[PDB]
Amino acid sequence: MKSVITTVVSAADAAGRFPSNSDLESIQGNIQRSAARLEAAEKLAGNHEAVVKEAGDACFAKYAYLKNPGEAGENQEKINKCYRDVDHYMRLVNYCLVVGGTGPLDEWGIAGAREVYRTLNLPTSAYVASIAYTRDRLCVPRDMSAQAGVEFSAYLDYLINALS
Amino acid sequence: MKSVITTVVSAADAAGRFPSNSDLESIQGNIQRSAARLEAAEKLAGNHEAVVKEAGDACFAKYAYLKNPGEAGENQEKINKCYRDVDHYMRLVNYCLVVGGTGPLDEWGIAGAREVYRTLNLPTSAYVASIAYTRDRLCVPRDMSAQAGVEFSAYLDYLINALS
Amino acid sequence: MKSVITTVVSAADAAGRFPSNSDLESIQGNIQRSAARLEAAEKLAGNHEAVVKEAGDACFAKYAYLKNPGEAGENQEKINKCYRDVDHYMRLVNYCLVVGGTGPLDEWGIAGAREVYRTLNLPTSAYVASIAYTRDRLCVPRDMSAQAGVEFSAYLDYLINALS
Amino acid sequence: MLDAFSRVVVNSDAKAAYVGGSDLQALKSFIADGNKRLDAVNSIVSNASCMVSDAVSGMICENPGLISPGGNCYTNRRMAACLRDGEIILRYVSYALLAGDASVLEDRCLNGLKETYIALGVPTNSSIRAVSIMKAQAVAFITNTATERKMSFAAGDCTSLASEVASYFDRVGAAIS
Amino acid sequence: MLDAFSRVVVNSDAKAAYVGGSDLQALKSFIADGNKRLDAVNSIVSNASCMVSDAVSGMICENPGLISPGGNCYTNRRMAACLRDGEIILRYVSYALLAGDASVLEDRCLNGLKETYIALGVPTNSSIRAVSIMKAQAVAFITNTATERKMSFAAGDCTSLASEVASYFDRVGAAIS
Amino acid sequence: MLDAFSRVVVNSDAKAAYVGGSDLQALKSFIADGNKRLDAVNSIVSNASCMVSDAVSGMICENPGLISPGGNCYTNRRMAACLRDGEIILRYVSYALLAGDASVLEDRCLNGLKETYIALGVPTNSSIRAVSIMKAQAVAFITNTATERKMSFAAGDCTSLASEVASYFDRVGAAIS
Amino acid sequence: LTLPGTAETNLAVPSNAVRKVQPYPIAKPPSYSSVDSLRPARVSRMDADWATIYEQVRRQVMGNAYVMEGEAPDIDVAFSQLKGGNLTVREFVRAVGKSASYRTRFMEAKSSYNFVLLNFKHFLGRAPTQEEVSTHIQILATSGLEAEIDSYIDSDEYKALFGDHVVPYVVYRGTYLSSERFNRMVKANPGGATSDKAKSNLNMIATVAADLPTDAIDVMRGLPSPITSETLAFGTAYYWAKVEKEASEGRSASPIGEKIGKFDHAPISTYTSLCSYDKVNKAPQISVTNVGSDEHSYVSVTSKYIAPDMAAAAQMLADCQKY
Amino acid sequence: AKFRGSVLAERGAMITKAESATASVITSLRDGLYSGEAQLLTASGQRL
Ligand SMILES: *C(=C)C1=C(C)[C@@H](Cc2[nH]c(/C=C3N=C(/C=C4\NC(=O)[C@H](C)[C@H]4[C@@H](*)C)C(C)=C\3CCC(=O)O)c(CCC(=O)O)c2C)NC1=O
Ligand SMILES: *C(C)[C@H]1/C(=C/C2=NC(=C\c3[nH]c(C[C@H]4NC(=O)C(C=C)=C4C)c(C)c3CCC(=O)O)/C(CCC(=O)O)=C2C)NC(=O)[C@@H]1C
Ligand SMILES: *[C@@H](C)[C@H]1/C(=C/C2=NC(=C\c3[nH]c(C[C@H]4NC(=O)C(C=C)=C4C)c(C)c3CCC(=O)O)/C(CCC(=O)O)=C2C)NC(=O)[C@@H]1C
Ligand SMILES: *[C@@H](C)[C@H]1/C(=C/C2=NC(=C\c3[nH]c(C[C@H]4NC(=O)C(C=C)=C4C)c(C)c3CCC(=O)O)/C(CCC(=O)O)=C2C)NC(=O)[C@@H]1C
Ligand SMILES: *[C@H](C)[C@H]1/C(=C/C2=NC(=C\c3[nH]c(C[C@H]4NC(=O)C(C=C)=C4C)c(C)c3CCC(=O)O)/C(CCC(=O)O)=C2C)NC(=O)[C@@H]1C
Ligand SMILES: *[C@H](C)[C@H]1/C(=C/C2=NC(=C\c3[nH]c(C[C@H]4NC(=O)C(C=C)=C4C)c(C)c3CCC(=O)O)/C(CCC(=O)O)=C2C)NC(=O)[C@@H]1C
Ligand SMILES: *[C@H](C)[C@H]1/C(=C/C2=NC(=C\c3[nH]c(C[C@H]4NC(=O)C(C=C)=C4C)c(C)c3CCC(=O)O)/C(CCC(=O)O)=C2C)NC(=O)[C@@H]1C
Ligand SMILES: *[C@H](C)[C@H]1/C(=C/C2=NC(=C\c3[nH]c(C[C@H]4NC(=O)C(C=C)=C4C)c(C)c3CCC(=O)O)/C(CCC(=O)O)=C2C)NC(=O)[C@@H]1C
Ligand SMILES: *[C@H](C)[C@H]1/C(=C/C2=NC(=C\c3[nH]c(C[C@H]4NC(=O)C(C=C)=C4C)c(C)c3CCC(=O)O)/C(CCC(=O)O)=C2C)NC(=O)[C@@H]1C
Ligand SMILES: *[C@H](C)[C@H]1/C(=C/C2=NC(=C\c3[nH]c(C[C@H]4NC(=O)C(C=C)=C4C)c(C)c3CCC(=O)O)/C(CCC(=O)O)=C2C)NC(=O)[C@@H]1C
Ligand SMILES: *[C@H](C)[C@H]1/C(=C/C2=NC(=C\c3[nH]c(C[C@H]4NC(=O)C(C=C)=C4C)c(C)c3CCC(=O)O)/C(CCC(=O)O)=C2C)NC(=O)[C@@H]1C
Ligand SMILES: *[C@H](C)[C@H]1/C(=C/C2=NC(=C\c3[nH]c(C[C@H]4NC(=O)C(C=C)=C4C)c(C)c3CCC(=O)O)/C(CCC(=O)O)=C2C)NC(=O)[C@@H]1C
Ligand SMILES: *[C@H](C)[C@H]1/C(=C/C2=NC(=C\c3[nH]c(C[C@H]4NC(=O)C(C=C)=C4C)c(C)c3CCC(=O)O)/C(CCC(=O)O)=C2C)NC(=O)[C@@H]1C
């Protein structure tokens, strides 16, 4: 959605011009970066259930007060929706690593979150604690490459800056 | 300030163009009409003490109730305002014959007049009878010429229609 | 579409006012002018085969480079459209002397003319070479009267000033 | 705005005087020389594209530091804006020649041109030269003494319109100074 | 609005699935012939003013009743809009060749073009001839088989980029008929 | 509005000169140390909501006369409008760091800001302290000498980017004052 | 009331604390537009008088309101300061939109979707998209009436098209940002004697600007174009479709049958269960309340309720390989 | 007209080539070429 390609074919469309020589030069930078972030997305796609069951309970280790009766974890089935909420964010991190920008994160996960989590009383501080843990469990030669770990970590703290 | 010259130069300025042939020949109609309306303006200028005293008492000879107490005429000066208020309306008709349009009658005599006389309780029907006495006074070889009297009649019942 | 009549009934419609004594005076000027422009419209509409044949090759005697290969009129079907392109413009001058304004020349001959001739690579200087030949060819007592040739030569350099 | 027929009725409105036959003889003589005024706007607007382009090219060829980099008529965007600025001025003069007084040149064009050209950086002394060439072209077109163009006129004198249109072109130079 | 990378993630959000590894080598092959996609858009947009003038005037020469009084390309006012109408079409099919799918073509140009043209009087089966001349011009440029302008490329084969740019020109004729 | 490459070609346009081998070499070093510039923007925009919440609350702990009534950051409404005021300034600085000069910062953020804060009564000396803590925060993250967070880079010297970002933050302080 | 020279109020960007009023009106957009040569000219502040300006504000910004001589005294106050130089005609339509006369005939008498559709017609002279609707309808839930009107006038679209000295009007551009942006502008803006007053809901553009599909009906677009573009299409050819359209735009027929919601039903002879088609899919709607001794447990036979055709997916989706 | 159209590019290109030679012989004469002791020892280099 908000990729490299759509942000230059919509600026050509609003001025009413053909794709220029500077518009093709932005797609040239999409060539050299695609080796880094599609091995950061292929790594996340085959490892996704392991990384959300270790970043999901980093919320509950840190914020353990929200398992009391009266809070956002009353029973067992809310905690399985609490893992379902954090598996949705890792899918959109995987979708925004394929596309090349923050397209799927902005239109599907960020927009509307200020009103849903406020009215359903789910704390944004305890969503950030699940995303800040998996940013810091990454070390750049073990899990991926060097620049694969940059662009995986670049879309994670964009989500933390959006939610806080 | 609304004649045949200022309606074509404020219509060509709105489109941003030079005075073309349709603008140049609508002022040809201000050449072959001005022999009549400048004749009828000269007869109004040299007779304006006479044609307000034939006409201004006609509102008191017909709407006779205004000279009663608690009314629009109590003293001689309020009657002397009424021969002054109609002499302004004969001065502006003299202004319309020399300009060649309905310029000074709109900008000085008609605009604002409906929310003056409603406030000050002056009847507009007692204005019209002083104008409509003057409209049927026209005797076509006697007062002015035959084509001078047509344009003199036209500005008088534009004023009646704006006061009706 | 742009006349003496249409400008004064659109200035009245924009204010929401009646036909006053101003715009009645301006169509008086359409009476004294249409004796003189309807014989320029009559002289053009019975002599138009001769006046576009001798104006078309005043273009090609000034610009003989247009008959070269790759240029604007390079074969006989493109030379025949040039004499059609000139005859289209002389017919709209005949419509402007009948209407009495620059109406048919504006919306059928001039609007979009700069877009078409820059896309199809037609020189506008070789269009004004055909129009300004007929402006200078006109003799004042021979071809028409004096004031028929004032009106004929005024719509010709309306067309020159819109193309130059 | 105001034409010559209604300039004399705002003077009569300041004393509430009926405009009679004393000051009408100036204004009956307006319609006597009324065909001469209509041939004089026709000789201006027929040659109006040649008058604009010759005036700015004579301004360029007498001050050629406007074409130098950092000049004001430097690029294509600024030379086209000077040609567009210069045909506004010829348009609003020919309204005021057709009306009779300059009450539309002063309110619709010149009211706020001096402080507009200072905030833009337009040189004012070159703008006097572009309208003084246009003043010299206009008095050569309505007195029929242009060297490369002759139009067909009736016989008579037309020097009281040439002195009138020189006063309209000198009001332009007095406002932007 | 969507490129080829966003097409496969709105196909995999519908299954609630991650974009894995077998749905990437059809997308890593998009990047590998990515320099030929960039040369193919460049050879359309370079000689594109010759494309929309040869297509419209070659549509005129096969139906010369659009030039007759009553045709829809009669005056200068309508011919200037027809040459402008044709280069919106060439603009949006080069946005769709650069991106890799026709979602900016299907949304911002073709959704509502049929009801625009029916309400305005445009002959909708003479407009398909101007798009089908433009399809023949575009596949002769990105296979370097034009007879009057050759361009300089590397050696190889672009017959699948020419095969999908014909599939965007066919989508214009199917949204208009 | 401009970047570092178009700052070069507006200097050569003043002399009507071709930009060639003398001052091409200053641009070939801009491209060569160009991945250093893109890591340095990326570290600013990744710590941006901690960085603006610490510089505004750092301004409060310097001067606690803004929490008393009569203060300008007194209310709950004015604390949100100051914490939004300070992240506009961070957003236009990171445009100017990514571009290469401070002409996006002059035209779109600092035009009329001095006249706004005077007419609002926003105190000037408390605002320079708000961007000075943002200046000390910016040079810590892009020389990687931050005490609470360390990011992974390749090794080398980036001190001339950190001397360029402090000239952008000193441009904001000089125009507010 | 403010000051005898002001160009902008309320200080939304910092660059209006230094901004001057424009000395001259802004030019037209520089694309071609063959339809704009068949249109009347722009009414601006410099060329027109105050009889032309107050009529053309009432013809575009107020629709056709039929404002009487005593009613709207608040617009007479804001016109008294327009003539004094205290606010521009950009600020004069901001005072008109935040007045109580604009509220009582467009806000509190129309609907909520329908209020946003008229504001693009009155202030911008076009019709929105669905993404433009849903950002202007959040301001009517979280910030009220006056912050919604302030987003049109302070937009970038307003100041490029009209600026400070031009009355709003229907701009014909040539190149549009989508082809559906053209023919929804023309549909929303017809000519004389139209007056969106007792048209109590639009209901045709209220469902066409709810889909980025459903390009609307071409006889609502061939109608309000300028003539000499639609002669030889309106003798008696498409003319009768215009007659039907104007009898069904007035009285406001709902498009649940023909335009949105499109269920090709079965044949009539293939069922013959409950006899006639008039009463075929009727089943009763029963609602009880059970509060004390005031209930009115009224069973009504409701109408032909149709399949949602959107809530049935879900079906063949929630049970595709599952269930 | 067809004959000129086919030879216009041939003719202007051969005139540009003849003037590039004159410009080269003038900068070469001033640059010290043709002043050598081996050029003045010939009879055709004395005429030049
Ligand atoms: C450059 C160094 C340079 C010029 C460019 C040119 C500018 C210039 N022109 C005049 C005088 C006139 N120009 C006229 C215009 C036209 N003549 C025509 O017949 C056509 C229709 C039209 C456009 C070419 C006219 C009529 C005049 C007046 C002379 C005359 O009677 O013919 C001036 C002098 C103005 C002045 O300074 O008073 C200048 C500077 N001249 C250049 O030197
Ligand atoms: C001074 C500018 C000229 C000049 C002018 C004279 N014109 C005379 C008569 C005349 N002129 C026109 C042209 C004009 N009238 C129109 O209605 C229109 C178009 C709508 C135009 C362009 C006409 C029709 C007439 C005939 C009327 C008549 O002859 O009375 C003229 C004769 C005296 C006079 O009418 O005042 C003069 C002197 N002649 C010149 O030599 C200079 C260059
Ligand atoms: C501009 C000249 C371009 C260019 C364009 C090409 N045109 C191609 C084919 C083509 N052109 C026309 C129109 C032409 N034929 C006519 O009969 C008439 C007039 C009556 C005209 C103007 C047609 C009909 C076609 C064929 C379309 C089809 O087959 O469906 C073309 C491709 C084939 C070819 O090379 O001829 C191109 C590239 N050619 C150029 O070099 C400049 C850049
Ligand atoms: C958020 C925690 C960031 C972060 C920010 C940094 N802050 C840096 C310096 C700094 N911070 C403050 C405010 C703080 N000090 C106080 O005394 C009070 C309360 C009264 C507060 C809230 C001040 C005053 C300063 C110093 C300003 C200056 O030096 O001119 C800073 C630079 C120093 C350092 O590297 O530690 C940074 C990077 N630090 C982080 O890592 C997270 C992401
Ligand atoms: C880098 C900081 C350290 C290091 C850390 C260790 N990580 C260990 C296990 C581990 N790490 C992750 C997250 C990681 N795996 C992924 O698949 C992805 C995303 C693609 C990420 C960021 C997870 C989920 C786990 C658990 C098991 C696993 O999947 O690998 C680990 C083992 C200790 C343990 O069992 O917890 C260590 C020591 N290792 C290093 O070499 C550098 C210093
Ligand atoms: C006489 C036939 C009427 C009549 C006349 C009165 N008019 C009074 C005041 C008045 N009239 C005007 C309009 C007048 N003034 C102008 O300047 C012009 C046009 C240039 C016109 C037509 C104005 C503005 C005013 C108010 C100013 C003033 O006080 O003079 C008036 C006095 C009203 C009062 O004192 O309450 C009278 C009596 N009223 C009549 O009884 C007959 C019907
Ligand atoms: C024509 C319809 C009749 C006729 C009528 C009479 N009018 C008489 C006197 C008179 N008329 C006016 C108005 C007139 N004078 C003007 O100065 C102007 C406008 C500029 C007009 C319309 C006045 C002021 C007077 C009084 C005397 C005077 O100053 O002229 C009149 C004599 C007495 C009377 O009945 O009012 C008659 C008979 N005369 C005719 O011969 C035909 C039949
Ligand atoms: C002759 C002196 C010219 C010249 C003329 C050519 N005009 C060509 C095409 C053309 N012309 C127009 C405008 C004209 N057609 C109209 O219908 C009307 C108004 C009713 C006017 C004024 C149009 C719109 C077109 C294009 C439509 C078409 O192709 O018929 C033309 C053909 C160009 C081509 O083949 O591509 C020529 C050659 N060319 C000359 O040599 C001098 C400059
Ligand atoms: C030419 C090859 C065609 C033809 C074209 C005409 N199109 C006319 C007007 C027009 N076209 C569009 C669509 C265009 N504008 C856009 O913004 C987009 C998509 C983003 C597209 C595709 C619009 C919206 C309009 C009208 C609005 C305007 O012009 O401002 C047109 C003018 C009709 C007339 O006035 O006579 C023509 C002639 N018609 C043909 O005959 C051939 C087949
Ligand atoms: C098919 C349309 C052509 C053709 C295309 C090929 N191009 C090949 C390589 C190549 N192409 C470009 C042009 C393009 N890339 C850009 O980045 C930009 C501007 C931003 C443009 C205009 C470049 C730079 C390269 C270099 C890559 C390289 O050589 O390593 C190519 C080789 C295979 C490939 O690289 O994919 C082909 C086949 N060749 C043809 O013969 C048809 C006509
Ligand atoms: C906080 C660290 C400051 C401080 C900030 C305040 N700013 C207030 C309002 C305000 N700020 C701007 C400028 C900003 N908006 C932009 O769009 C751009 C760039 C394009 C910039 C730089 C504007 C235009 C406004 C007025 C709009 C508004 O009122 O929201 C503000 C609110 C004032 C109030 O109403 O109380 C505050 C508190 N003030 C401080 O004391 C510290 C130093
Ligand atoms: C008259 C004695 C009729 C009658 C008339 C009513 N018409 C009402 C409102 C109305 N009429 C028009 C059309 C008119 N206005 C225009 O601007 C144009 C053309 C340019 C025309 C032909 C419009 C547009 C409107 C609504 C505008 C507004 O609200 O002011 C009307 C008002 C209805 C009401 O409020 O009750 C009436 C009563 N009704 C009759 O009974 C006789 C037959
Ligand atoms: C009457 C007893 C006075 C007097 C009044 C005049 N006021 C004139 C124009 C005018 N007045 C205002 C201020 C008014 N408008 C407002 O919105 C508010 C407060 C919210 C107020 C107090 C404005 C803005 C204007 C200009 C707009 C307009 O009405 O045209 C005025 C017209 C002047 C003229 O052109 O002749 C008058 C006569 N003047 C007096 O002599 C007494 C003291």
Ligand SMILES: *[C@H](C)[C@H]1/C(=C/C2=NC(=C\c3[nH]c(C[C@H]4NC(=O)C(C=C)=C4C)c(C)c3CCC(=O)O)/C(CCC(=O)O)=C2C)NC(=O)[C@@H]1C
């Ligand atoms: C939730 C209980 C429903 C459901 C709701 C959705 N409504 C969506 C959009 C929408 N709703 C309205 C009507 C409402 N909004 C208003 O502003 C007003 C009054 C002025 C009313 C009555 C409108 C007008 C709109 C469109 C504009 C907007 O976004 O608010 C909606 C979004 C659809 C989408 O784009 O995906 C949803 C999901 N849908 C459900 O499934 C449950 C049953």
